[PDB]
């Protein structure tokens, strides 16, 4: 895993010694080279995972997340170079360094075999994200959003540290392979109940769970575009990955202890979806859609069946790609019209036809159109939850309506109808925005051809 | 003050602390404590302001009461043991008296009331000297007598110090009072782990000393005493704002910075003894310390408060302050996590 | 740092170099009293350094290459705009007054440093003890508001207590009629826009609040317009004075060492000029200050320290 | 009411005015064209196409098809000796010591 950490940490001299006019070109070129290099993690075996040393390993669950992260960094570099065009050079280099540090922390978080190292860099991912949100956010409410995000995460995740140190003192090790071969059942006691709660609540907050999701429609809105990409495409999936890793040790208490939380998502993904029917804000609409999809992921993890696990992996990857693309489209509209409200700019298909095509395709992939991997993940979670209980299909099917009921709604008021008369600064679409949309979307449709590389470690 | 006299007084402070550290007799511990108090009194009176006189008077009265209680404990242990060797005490009453005496000396709650007072009324260098150097000798005396320390009393003092320090630092605007309440919370952290593993107490003491030295050196370099001048610092020099943001990030225990190193290690020595409620409660309370550190970083570096017209004149002059060991203390306090097992040199 | 505690320890006492001619003499008067040349006349009788009156670009002459910087970097104010528009809505009057007070403070610090370091006497014009006589003359004419006076009083109270008053203060008495005659005589076009009531208020606050204020802290000498034309009489008067008043008598070597350490730190001198009081006349917003500071860094010889600028031709940077 | 000194908000810049052939990456035309070429070359023709070729020719991912071949052995054994096609026990019940009760 040293072959990816070292070039990522050498990206900082690359971005700090470059000229004032070629930082973007050099950083995008070398991050695309690292994304190409990332494909050597597909050497997965049907029985054994890929173990590199005592410190790092990568099974078939971490590999799609690593490839997605190192593919996502150049996309952020291309997106965040227009609202920072007038910025000072030193602050531009500091922003690029924050992005590089965030990628380095993420790609060594996804590969740590030891759990306290995973916790340490899982919380080291807080600092660059928070700095980006509270520094390069636009309006006044970025400070409150940063406070909410940081304090929800830390107040949920300090008992996780306490529980992990207790595990290290009790079992004797925190290596994931040793814990895979030394796992003991957890009996029925109040101590084990709070053990389960301390292990679960950090990832509950970072998923987010309904009722603990109040930091999402702030931090996903006040942040800049690259902050929106990392907020919607990696960190939520990082919480899901941690949940998948740590649910191994919490058997068989989970078989009843997951009983409330499933309801807190099974109803929750209804309510937040209904919020998208009556949202006056485009970015808030995308954030609440992310809440609903990740609640579906929560249910899939908590019922702990194989089909649900592969559905959760495919759903996480597909939702990350789709949410990043939707945030890019909303940011392009916000750059053109200088307001975030959805009803201000209407009828943009008459002026911007190809961006309307990208909008249509992104909305179609949002509402789980087959044979996309969004539909594959949603379908597999549906099969597993039907095996769990029958009436759950109702809670699925109604959601299958409401999702489309906002997605096409998001397609209409932003693209269809009569255009706004007084808005006359609708410039034609740049090559950069179209290239960003294509680089977001074409990997998703190509992954629809060969989905078996994202179907989890038990495929 | 003459430079020679100031140097002699500073070496007298150092000699008093060293005398407390290296002696094996209780009378010499008392002698070193009086040496330290008597020699540190004029440093607080460096400017000859009414506030400095009142701060020195309050410090004198608190230290006098603490020293008298310490002598009472020494005399009781003399009566009930017939010896003066600095080791475990042979009476619970003498142990209790000595523990509250050293708690009054360290500023532990509910004897903390002088710490935000006194630090406000004295200059920045003298406040740094107080909050870092004056805490070495009582911690050594607490280290030597831990076989006789009551667990209930020391843990009550630790949790009271942490809670009161967080809730006190939540309110202030002045930087010196913020550092005082942060000091109170940090000594609650250091005394909470003393009876389990004193090596972690030494490690937390060293890390706290480095962080307080870095923050006070930054404040002296920028000549800032309130939060609004610290906000103004962004126009004069941005690198100073970056440094104070990173140092305040590290002071809150945010990983991967070095401030995560002590407290986490403390948890590792309290879940071994099957004490789970107390470290979780202490981390939950230290979130408030993180909150007012976050408020300071919001005011200083993450935004830009408005400046004045005369600040342009300050653009024409380079700084000439002897920022001694500022880069070394900034590096050592923030990137020391990957060398965590080096704490084994303190065992 | 060439001076500090170590030089004081080894024997560089400031009382060894202070002679009987090491006096701080400040020459005052109205805006056209003809005091200027008179101070220079004193400067060519006792061998004293003559500091000209501190304007907007005094600090620009002290540092850098000595050239005056553009007005958007230094001051952000105009004297001619104040003369033409004394009641401007952008607060140019109080902004200029505060900048002039800061320049006078810097000049007083430089004068004190030169006097305490070389032992040579210094002649100044309109020191910080005689700047408020303009400020009230603004406020009594309705040019500025009361909060400007409150901010000026706060800044002066927190920054004037750390210095010493001059040994001799010289005042030139010229009526406002002859002042306006001189103003018409010189012919600076913006200067006829001044009013006679402004000069009358300047004279009133000179006589009623200033000379009684430092009658006791220094020796006061008052001259009219035709006694000032004879410099020999003036230097005869200042050479026959018995200095037994003020705080200059009880000055030990330690006190002058502390004062010299204070005046040599220019950022410490101007520490309390930019106090965080938000008045609309002096408060500059974040974006404007950021843009102006970024422009200031791009000037030649201004990005780095005074010896680390390669664009002006400094060598051996890698060994410094 | 008198207010503080502040620059007014600058007007929104259009990149198509000073450069009608702009790709939207930078104001400098040569830097614009080179950034577009770098993005289009290393994104589409280096990572996307070669990555699809790499994933399409992965060497027997997760041993999957190998198991199919092994099944084509095992049934061929177990249909030739009259053995049951699948046993109901994963391990040999002889070598398992059940607790007595």
């Amino acid at each position: 895993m040293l072959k990816y950490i070292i070039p990522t940490m050498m990206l900082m001299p690359l971005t700090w010694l470059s000229k004032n006019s070629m930082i973007w070109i050099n950083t995008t070129l070398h991050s695309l080279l690292i994304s190409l290099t990332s494909l050597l993690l597909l050497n997965q075996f049907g029985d054994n995972s890929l173990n590199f040393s005592l410190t790092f390993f990568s099974d078939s669950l971490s590999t799609p997340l690593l490839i997605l992260t190192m593919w996502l960094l150049p996309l952020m570099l291309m997106a965040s170079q227009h609202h920072l065009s007038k910025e000072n050079l030193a602050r531009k280099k500091l922003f690029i360094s924050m992005l590089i540090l965030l990628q380095l922390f993420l790609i060594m978080t996804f590969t740590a075999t030891e759990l306290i190292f995973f916790y340490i860099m899982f919380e080291a991912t807080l600092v660059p994200t928070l700095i980006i949100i509270t520094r390069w956010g636009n309006q006044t409410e970025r400070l409150n959003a940063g406070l909410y995000f940081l304090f929800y995460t830390l107040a949920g995740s300090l008992p996780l540290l306490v529980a992990l140190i207790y595990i290290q003192n009790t079992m004797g090790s925190l290596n994931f392979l040793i814990l895979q071969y030394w796992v003991q059942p957890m009996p029925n006691s109040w101590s084990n109940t709070f053990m389960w709660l301390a292990c679960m609540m950090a990832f509950m907050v970072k998923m987010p769970l309904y009722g603990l999701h109040l930091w999402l429609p702030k931090a996903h809105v006040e942040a800049p575009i690259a902050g929106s990409m990392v907020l919607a495409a990696i960190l939520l999936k990082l919480g899901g990955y941690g949940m998948m890793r740590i649910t191994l040790l919490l058997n068989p208490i989970t078989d009843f202890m997951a009983y409330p939380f499933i309801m807190l998502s099974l109803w929750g993904m209804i309510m937040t979806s209904s919020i998208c029917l009556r949202q006056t804000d485009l970015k808030s609409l995308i954030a609440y859609s992310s809440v609903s999809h990740m609640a579906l992921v929560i249910v899939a993890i908590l019922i702990q069946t194989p089909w649900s696990y592969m559905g959760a992996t495919a759903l996480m990857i597909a939702h990350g790609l789709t949410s990043s693309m939707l945030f890019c489209l909303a940011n392009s509209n916000y750059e053109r019209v200088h307001s975030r409200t959805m009803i201000l700019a209407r009828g943009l298909q008459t002026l911007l036809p190809l961006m309307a095509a990208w909008w249509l395709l992104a909305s179609l992939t949002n509402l789980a159109l087959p044979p996309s991997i969004n539909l594959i993940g949603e379908l597999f979670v549906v099969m597993s939850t039907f095996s769990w209980s029958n009436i759950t299909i109702i809670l699925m099917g109604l959601n299958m309506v409401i999702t489309a009921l906002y997605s096409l709604y998001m397609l209409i008021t932003t693209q269809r109808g009569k255009h706004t008369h007084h808005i006359n600064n609708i410039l034609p679409s740049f090559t950069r925005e179209n290239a960003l949309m294509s680089l977001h979307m074409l990997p998703l449709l190509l992954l629809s051809l060969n989905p078996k590389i994202i179907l989890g470690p038990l495929y | 003050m003459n430079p020679i006299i100031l140097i002699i007084i500073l070496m007298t402070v150092m000699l008093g602390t060293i005398i407390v550290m290296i002696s094996t007799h209780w009378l010499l511990i008392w002698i070193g404590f009086e040496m330290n108090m008597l020699a540190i009194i004029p440093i607080m009176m460096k400017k000859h302001n009414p506030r400095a006189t009142e701060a020195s008077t309050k410090y004198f009265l608190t230290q006098s009461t603490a020293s008298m209680l310490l002598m009472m404990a020494i005399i009781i242990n003399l009566m009930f043991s017939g010896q003066w060797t600095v080791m475990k005490l042979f009476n619970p009453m003498a142990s209790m008296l000595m523990t509250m005496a050293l708690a009054m000396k360290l500023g532990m709650a509910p004897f903390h009331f002088w710490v935000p007072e006194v630090t406000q009324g004295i200059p920045l260098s003298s406040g740094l000297i107080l909050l870092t150097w004056q805490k070495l000798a009582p911690m050594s005396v607490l280290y030597q007598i831990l076989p006789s320390i009551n667990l209930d009393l020391i843990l009550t003092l630790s949790i009271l110090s942490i809670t009161i320090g967080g809730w006190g630092g939540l309110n202030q605007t002045q930087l010196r009072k913020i550092m005082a309440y942060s000091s109170i919370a940090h000594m609650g952290w250091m005394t909470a782990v003393l009876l389990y593993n004193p090596t972690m107490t030494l490690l937390n003491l060293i890390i706290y000393i480095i962080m307080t030295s870095t923050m006070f050196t930054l404040f002296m370099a920028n000549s800032t005493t309130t939060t609004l001048s610290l906000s103004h610092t962004w126009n004069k020099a941005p690198i100073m704002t970056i440094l104070v943001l990173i140092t305040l990030l590290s002071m809150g225990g945010l990983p991967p910075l070095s401030g995560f190193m002590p407290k986490w290690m403390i948890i590792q020595e309290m879940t071994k003894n099957d004490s789970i409620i107390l470290p979780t409660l202490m981390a939950i309370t230290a979130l408030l310390n993180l909150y007012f550190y976050m408020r300071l970083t919001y005011s200083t570096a993450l935004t830009m408060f408005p400046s004045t017209n005369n600040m342009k004149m300050k653009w024409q002059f380079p700084t000439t302050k002897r920022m001694t060991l500022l880069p070394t203390m900034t590096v050592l306090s923030t990137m020391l996590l990957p060398l965590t097992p080096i704490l084994s040199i303190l065992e | 740092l060439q001076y500090g505690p170590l030089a004081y320890i080894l024997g560089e006492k400031t009382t060894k170099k202070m002679t009987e001619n090491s006096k701080l003499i400040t020459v005052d008067g109205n805006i056209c009293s003809g005091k200027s040349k008179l101070a220079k006349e004193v400067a060519e009788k006792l061998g004293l350094k003559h500091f000209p009156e501190a304007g907007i670009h005094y600090a620009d002459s002290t540092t850098g290459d000595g050239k005056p910087l553009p007005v958007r970097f230094s001051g952000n104010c105009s004297l001619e705009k104040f003369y033409d528009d004394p009641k401007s809505n952008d607060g140019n009057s109080y902004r200029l007054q505060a900048w002039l007070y800061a320049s006078r403070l810097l000049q007083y610090a430089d004068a004190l440093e030169h006097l305490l370091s070389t032992g040579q006497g210094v002649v100044l014009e309109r020191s910080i003890y005689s700047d408020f006589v303009f400020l009230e003359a603004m406020y009594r004419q309705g040019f500025i508001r009361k909060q400007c006076v409150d901010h000026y009083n706060q800044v002066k109270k927190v920054t004037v207590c750390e210095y010493l008053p001059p040994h001799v203060v010289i005042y030139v008495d010229v009526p406002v009629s002859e002042v306006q005659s001189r103003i018409q005589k010189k012919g600076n076009p913006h200067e006829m826009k001044i009013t006679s009531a402004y000069l009358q208020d300047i004279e009133n606050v000179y006589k009623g609040t200033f000379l009684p204020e430092m009658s006791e802290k220094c020796e006061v000498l008052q001259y009219s317009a035709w006694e000032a034309e004879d410099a020999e009489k003036v230097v005869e008067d200042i050479q026959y004075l018995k200095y037994d008043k003020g705080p200059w008598l009880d000055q030990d070597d330690r006190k002058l060492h502390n004062l010299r350490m204070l005046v040599q730190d220019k950022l410490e001198v101007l520490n309390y000029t930019s106090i965080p009081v938000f008045l609309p006349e002096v408060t500059i917003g974040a974006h404007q200050s950021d843009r102006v500071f970024q422009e200031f860094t791009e000037l030649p010889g201004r990005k780095y320290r005074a010896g680390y600028n390669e664009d002006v031709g400094d060598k051996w940077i890698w060994l410094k | 009411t008198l207010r503080w000194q502040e620059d007014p908000e600058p007007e929104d810049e259009n990149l198509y005015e000073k450069n009608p052939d702009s790709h939207g990456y930078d104001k400098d035309p040569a830097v614009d064209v080179w950034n577009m070429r770098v993005v289009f070359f290393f994104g589409f023709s280096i990572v996307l196409v070669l990555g699809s070729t790499f994933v399409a020719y992965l060497p027997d991912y997760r041993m999957q098809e190998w198991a199919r071949r092994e099944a084509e052995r095992l049934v061929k054994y177990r249909e030739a000796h009259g053995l049951p096609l699948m046993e109901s026990n994963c391990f040999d019940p002889s070598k398992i010591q059940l607790p007595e009760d």
Binding site: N138 | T173, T227, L228 | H287 | E9, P10
Partner: peptide, 19 residues
């Protein structure tokens, strides 16, 4: 349009005697 930065009243509510 541009990034919001703290104005006079924000700095005043952050710069009193107590929070």
């Amino acid at each position: 349009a541009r990034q919001w930065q703290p104005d006079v009243e924000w700095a005043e509510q952050y710069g009193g005697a107590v929070m």
